[PDB]
Amino acid sequence: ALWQFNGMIKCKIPSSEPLLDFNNYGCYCGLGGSGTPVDDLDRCCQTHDNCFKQAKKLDSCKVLVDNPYTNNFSYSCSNNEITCSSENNACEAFICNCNRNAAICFSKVPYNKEHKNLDKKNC
Ligand SMILES: [Ca+2]
């Protein structure tokens, strides 16, 4: 889920509005994504995109049929750390981990403004 991904990123980077700051960055952060990641933050998004793609192939996800986009989940944020809930079923848990991994990834890499709003055709 997106709206949950948004909260997860804010947990690690509280000075940020994720849907504004990490959208449309490089070749992978945002809609679609193809080509070579332009920097480490773009690589975080590529990994994320790959993780959701993988989620769709998961039987536990198919056998409920709702998507990486619809499969909700629960997580908690305690002084800048995210915990995916043990109550999450296998599908919700996979998606929560994809999101958690990307949030941690975003907080550990440089943000290069020259890559914001890249012409995705040089991707
Ligand atoms: Ca993407």
Swiss-Prot record:
Binding site for Ca(2+): Y28, G30, G32, D49
One BP annotation, GO: phosphatidylcholine metabolic process
Record's catalysed reaction(s): a 1,2-diacyl-sn-glycero-3-phosphocholine + H2O = a 1-acyl-sn-glycero-3-phosphocholine + a fatty acid + H(+); 1,2-ditetradecanoyl-sn-glycero-3-phosphocholine + H2O = 1-tetradecanoyl-sn-glycero-3-phosphocholine + tetradecanoate + H(+); 1,2-dihexadecanoyl-sn-glycero-3-phosphocholine + H2O = 1-hexadecanoyl-sn-glycero-3-phosphocholine + hexadecanoate + H(+); 1-hexadecanoyl-2-(9Z-octadecenoyl)-sn-glycero-3-phosphocholine + H2O = 1-hexadecanoyl-sn-glycero-3-phosphocholine + (9Z)-octadecenoate + H(+)
EC number: 3.1.1.4
Cofactor entry: Ca(2+)
PTM entry text: Activated by trypsin cleavage in the duodenum. Can also be activated by thrombin or autocatalytically.
Organism domain of life: Eukaryota
Cellular compartments annotated: Secreted
Family designation: Belongs to the phospholipase A2 family.
Subunit structure: Monomer or homodimer.
Protein name: Phospholipase A2
Segment of the intact protein contained: 23 to 145 of 145
